[PDB]
Structure 1
Amino acid sequence: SFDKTTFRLLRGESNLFYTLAKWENNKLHVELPESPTMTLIYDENGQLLWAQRDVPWLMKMIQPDWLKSNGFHEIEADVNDTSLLLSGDHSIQQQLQEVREDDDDAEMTHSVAVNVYPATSRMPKLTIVVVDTIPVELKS
């Protein structure tokens, strides 16, 4: 329902990462903004350069063709994968346990903002992907 609002908010986080990043000696240097979101940074060929967290099941859901354009996406995660993603969020596990007990095949929806930054004199082309780790179904 809030697709444009959700994208605009996550794009703000993407832009913050971009301003703070540096490129030196053919390597990306990422500074964290002053987290309920998880950011992934790819180069112009879709190579992952930097990830805020290491989450293999989620990386497989970021479709390579998305990385060419600015846009909003949602990914559907199995509830047990969302649960693991939110392992450190002890307050939300009881709601997830209730979702799982209600339906073994439950899926959680995670918002995704894909943001493209053409190469400049100081930075190569980057695609910054910001994922909300809190699923839409549980943001209440």
Structure 2
Amino acid sequence: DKTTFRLLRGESNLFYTLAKWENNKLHVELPENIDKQSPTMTLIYDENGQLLWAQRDVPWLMKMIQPDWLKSNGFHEIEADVNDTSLLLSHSIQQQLQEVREDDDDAEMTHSVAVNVYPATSRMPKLTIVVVDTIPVELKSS
């Protein structure tokens, strides 16, 4: 909750820091195995809500992010089913998800989402960074 919020807001900063504008475009300089260094998903939008960069293409995830949310700092929650939650990681969370599947394969998983607004800068346009924790809330205890 509070530690989730802080660690998610902290990952937003890492990506902001590592982001650059070259060739009239946004690029992020990330270590080789970023996906594996953290169980998070990041998206980066402009002041008008247009996607500029996605750690990956995640349809269900992109329809959950209400444009409204991009105009202010916030902590939200989105929902996915076990099947989508598992593609977010596609390692041992997989066994746990199978266990959720054994009792209810239509089970809903809740994911925390941090929205961070960055006012434009001399070397950086106004930007909105969105960070989604990929470990559902129902599996945190483990």
1:15 is aligned to: 13
Q: Answer yes or no: is 1:63 the counterpart of 2:77.
A: no
Q: Are 1:16 and 1:33, in contact at CA under 8 Å, matched by a contact in 2?
A: no
Shift of 1:28: 0.3
Q: Are 1:46 and 1:64, in contact at CA under 8 Å, matched by a contact in 2?
A: yes
For residues 73 and 33 of structure 1, do their structure 2 counterparts lie closer, same or farther at Cα, with a shift above 3 Å needed?
Answer: farther
Q: Tell me the distance in 1 between the aligned counterparts of 2:17 and 2:94.
A: 34
Output one character per residue of 1:48-85: Cα deviation in whole Å (capped at 9) or x when no partner: 11111221111111111000100101111111111222
Output one character per residue of 1:11-58: Cα deviation in whole Å (capped at 9) or x when no partner: 111011111211123200111268311111011111111111221111
| Aligned residue pair count | 136
Q: Tell me the distance in 2 between the aligned counterparts of 1:44 and 1:25.
A: 19
Output one character per residue of 1:76-111: Cα deviation in whole Å (capped at 9) or x when no partner: 111111122221xx3121211111221132011111
For residues 55 and 38 of structure 1, do their structure 2 counterparts lie closer, same or farther at Cα, with a shift above 3 Å needed?
Answer: same
For residues 113 and 33 of structure 1, do their structure 2 counterparts lie closer, same or farther at Cα, with a shift above 3 Å needed?
Answer: farther
Q: Tell me the distance in 2 between the aligned counterparts of 1:96 and 1:20.
A: 33
Matches within 5 A, 1:22-61: 22-32=20-30, 35-61=38-64
For normalisation by structure 2, the TM-score amounts to 0.89
Shift of 1:121: 1.0
Q: Which consecutive unaligned segments of at least 5 residues does structure 2 have?
A: 33-37
Q: Secondary structure at the match of 2:102?
A: helix
For residues 6 and 33 of structure 1, do their structure 2 counterparts lie closer, same or farther at Cα, with a shift above 3 Å needed?
Answer: farther
Percent sequence identity is 100
For residues 33 and 64 of structure 1, do their structure 2 counterparts lie closer, same or farther at Cα, with a shift above 3 Å needed?
Answer: farther
Q: Tell me the distance in 1 between the aligned counterparts of 2:105 and 2:4.
A: 28
For residues 83 and 51 of structure 1, do their structure 2 counterparts lie closer, same or farther at Cα, with a shift above 3 Å needed?
Answer: same
Q: Tell me the distance in 1 between the aligned counterparts of 2:26 and 2:105.
A: 41
